[PDB]
Amino acid sequence: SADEELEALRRQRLAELQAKHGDPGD
């Protein structure tokens, strides 16, 4: 799981972060 393992790592840190993203600029 060279890429796979990291995939969970990068998705874990990425998916979560990318989920709390946004920018209304109000």
From Swiss-Prot:
Q: In which tissues is it expressed?
A: Widely expressed. Highest levels in heart, testis, kidney, pituitary gland, adrenal gland and placenta.
Induction behaviour: Activated in cells undergoing apoptosis.
Disulfide bridges in this chain: none
Spell out the family assignment given in the record's similarity comment: Belongs to the PDCD5 family.
In UniProt terms, what function does this protein have? Answer: May function in the process of apoptosis.
Gene name as annotated: PDCD5
**In-chain residues carrying the UniProt-annotated modification N-acetylalanine:** A2
Section covered of the full-length record = 1 to 26 of 125
| Name under which the protein is recorded | Programmed cell death protein 5
